[model samples]
Target: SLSAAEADLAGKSWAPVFANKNANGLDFLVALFEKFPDSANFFADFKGKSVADIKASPKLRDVSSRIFTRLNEFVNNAANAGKMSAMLSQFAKEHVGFGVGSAQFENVRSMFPGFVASVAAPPAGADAAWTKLFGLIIDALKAAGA
Candidate 1:
């Protein structure tokens, strides 16, 4: 469970961006791929495309929606470790078919807080809260064998 401060800061930080789901979702993916360009190779259709092109693709938008929606679920249920763990485990299993493994999830785990904090530019202490939140997810996901 997140501390009360962590939950509040994360909720506040995530709210605005979550409201602008499509754009922020795309931005999140863009940030991730920009920081780890080689990771884009995981998607056959996205492999050779420029970031702009990838961003414009409908498929990318769909994926972004899925990601952000799931993230929202995590945020809303911050204190529910069991639920989040199950979700991550299911996601990891489903993604295994696409060759996504612990390494890719680990990369996202490392990069996600920075991406959210940069894009949302939440209050001062929110960065630390987000970091801890992401860390919690990383720990749970890894423990679930993701």
Candidate 2:
């Protein structure tokens, strides 16, 4: 669980980002593919879709919405390890079934900070908070079988 101050900070910062979750999500996916074109392998539906198409695709938009919803869930449940574990496990299993691997998970992890920064103005110690948060996420992934 994140410290009280940290979790509060995170949740507060998460609001604006979540407000535009759909558009941000589309931008996120597009940024991901743009950074690593090869990473599209896990997105079967999005495979062969050009960056432009992905940015404009309904499928990507829907997926982005879901992604942000889960992100909100993740932030909301930070103090509840029981729920977070189940959710994080589900999150990992969803990708694993799609052939997602450690590198891909890392790709998301590595990209997340930049992604967050692109959309929001975080407070002091925000980067460290995200670092610690992602560390917990990865820890949950390993425990739940990544």
Candidate 3:
């Protein structure tokens, strides 16, 4: 469970975030690579590729959705701490095998929730709520990354 403010504010804005299937997060990845060119190395296929090329790739579509999908699920289950932690642990278990440690996740977290806000017209205080939500998420990820 989250604080009352988090549940209310984030819960209120989720409708806008969840709706509009066209609200996919392709731009978020494109922007990530643009802002931090080295982060592009994380994607073997995308490495050395231009942001436009990365955006055009069908693989980017899948990759971007993988991010957004988990976010969607996490936001959907924000009211359930146990469920959210389970998702994080499962993801960490799956990722540790691939050597995804805290650095990569921390880098992604630097911009993720902000990008989420960019796509949604969340009302006042939604920023703090989103921050709190991702704080829990990234904390879980960081702990498991250790």
Candidate 4:
């Protein structure tokens, strides 16, 4: 769970990264695929695609944008539990057939910190806050059974 201060920090820290949302999100997917190659098996379009292919993929771009946009919604609505719940619920439901589940999201949960850290390089102490923020998002997903 993030304290108010931590939430604010996390939101601020994430803003810059999301500004280049398409790139960072693509980077994130690449990192996830590199670390968990099997993760890519879920996507039909990604089945035979090389990492470079994935990077240049319009499907990948669309997926990345959706992911970052959802994340932005979550971060920006941190103070509004109802809105957060609604947003995540919709996201979860929408992803029901695309192989999104606890384990897959857990892969993201583990990898996104490194993704953001590599790109954003927040102040030293802020890493923990950011990590916790990601954890909270995962927790929310789990809680909603997403």
Candidate 5:
């Protein structure tokens, strides 16, 4: 279903742009909010609803994964890094508008560290590479809010 590079990335964990746990992105946001107990109340009222409940399809999950994989591929291609950050930033911004919130923001933030620990921890520069990728991603996310 993905390209050769995508298949390689599939073996790794990616914090999806949208969660499929409930076939609605609520769970994804819930998980993120879980880390921000203070913001939990902001969306707590929506705790049990699915994306369908809001008339939104759960397809964003695929988009998230595609972007994640694309970002990974770009990590190995210095040339693409410029565009990669811009794309990821727009994606995250759109995600927020879709239903994500500041309360659960860090939930997704932690994913970058996780990504580094898993794929970049060893092999020397692997860690730096992963961090660079996340920086690009995070920078983009921040820009989207700009």
Candidate 6:
């Protein structure tokens, strides 16, 4: 959907901070898991895990942010939605055996809406635009991965 350049620019700029908030926002679910770990077998492992665990590090955080920023821009701004979805579909296969497939897809999908919303929301400070764009990319990741 998004050009590679656009995605890279957004990812490198605002992913880490937004990712932190995303993790923090899930505090309620995390606490719930701590209390009743087995309530939702699909989300069982992520009950207390932080977003940092997955979206941390300059490599993952930045790269992921960039991927989504450009994608959102393209999908939302551009008229070629089919081409964009096809592009993402290809990217999703990058993690076949190791990804959110088989049994993990459903659980992963369920938790994604919150993360998507968080990313879509305004950033706490000045870099709000970048954060918002990157959040869209995160949603793309879930769709691709799922």
lDDT of 3 by residue, 1-146 (tens): 57666777786776665565334567767778887777777676787888888877878878877877777787777777888778878877776676666666666767756765777767798777777776776676677764
Q: Evaluate all candidate structures by whole-model CA lDDT and list the values in order.
A: 0.75, 0.75, 0.72, 0.73, 0.44, 0.42
Measured against the true structure, the TM-scores of the candidates, in listed sequence, are: 0.80, 0.87, 0.80, 0.80, 0.41, 0.33
lDDT of 4 by residue, 5-107 (tens): 7768777778778888877878887888888788788888798778888887778988777768878877777656667667656776666557566677777
For 1-146, candidate 2 gives per-residue lDDT tens digits of 67768877788767777788767777877888988888876787788888887777667877777877778888888777788678777877776677675566567778877877888777777667667777776765666466
Q: Point out the worst 10-residue segment of candidate 2 by lDDT.
A: 137-146
lDDT of 3: 0.72
Q: Which clashing pairs does model 6 show?
A: 11-66, 68-137
Off by over 4 Å in 2: none
Off by over 4 Å in 3: none
Write candidate 6's Cα lDDT for 7-82 as tens digits.
Answer: 4544433344245643543442443334444433433334344554533333333444454454444434422446
For candidate 4, report its TM-score: 0.80
**Residue lDDT tens for model 1, 1-146:** 56667778888888878888998898888888888887788887799888988877889888888989988887776766677567656765666667666677667867766776666678777777766766765654555455
**Model 2 TM-score relative to the real fold:** 0.87
- Candidate 3: Cα lDDT at 120: 73
- After superposition, candidate 6 runs with Cα above 4 Å error: 1-60, 70-81, 97-99, 117-146
lDDT score at residue 22, model 5, on the 0-100 scale: 32
Q: Which pairs of residues have clashing backbones in candidate 5?
A: 24-51, 89-140, 120-127
Choose 2 or 5, whichever is better by TM-score. 2
Index of the highest-TM-score prediction: 2
Clashing pairs in 4: none
With candidate 3 superimposed using the best TM-score fit, by how many Å does residue 23's alpha carbon deviate from the native?
4.8
Query: Against the true structure, candidate 5 has what lDDT?
Result: 0.44
